Amino acid sequence: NLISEQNVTVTMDLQPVLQLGMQGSETVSFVFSQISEYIGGLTQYGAVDLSVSSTVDWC
Amino acid sequence: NLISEQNVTVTMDLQPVLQLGMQGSETVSFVFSQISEYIGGLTQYGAVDLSVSSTVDWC
Numbered sequence: 001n002l003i004s005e006q007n008v009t010v011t012m013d014l015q016p017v018l019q020l021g022m023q024g025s026e027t028v029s030f031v032f033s034q035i036s037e038y039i040g041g042l043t044q045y046g047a048v049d050l051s052v053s054s055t056v057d058w059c
Numbered sequence: 060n061l062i063s064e065q066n067v068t069v070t071m072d073l074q075p076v077l078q079l080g081m082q083g084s085e086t087v088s089f090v091f092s093q094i095s096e097y098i099g100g101l102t103q104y105g106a107v108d109l110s111v112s113s114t115v116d117w118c
Contacts, residue, residue, distance in 0.1 A: 004082065007105030013095045 017055045024048040076114050083107035 030042050052058070089101045111117070 005105065005108070009102060009104050011099075011102075013099075 014055075017053070018058065019053040021051045021053075022048050023051070073114075076112070077117065078112040080110040080112075081107055082110070 024047055028044065028047050030044075032038055032042065083106050087103065087106050089103075091097055091101065
């Protein structure tokens with residue numbers, strides 16, 4: 001079986017892509033100006049929304 | 060038995076023919092331009108193909 005061949009090398013670089021994105025402001029400001037603000041505290045709902053993408057099992 | 064003869068001399072020249080043919084580029088180049096190239100290393104598959112012909116037992 002006389003042959004003539006050409007060889008290629010396939011190099012797959014499986015990088016560990018971990019991508020955590022956020023859809024909120026980087027700076028979260030708490031301004032305490034009222035007495036009710038002090039006594040009851042300040043609450044901001046949904047300040048950050050994290051979307052997660054990952055190659056590997058993550059925590 | 061009276062005769063008349065003509066003599067021809069046959070000279071056998073058994074030369075030791077060794078023939079190693081190659082079907083690859085003479086220059087094999089390794090270019091380490093990326094980090095993964097450094098870390099995982101560079102591999103080139105089937106860079107050289109050696110075809111062998113020989114009169115005598117060879118190594």
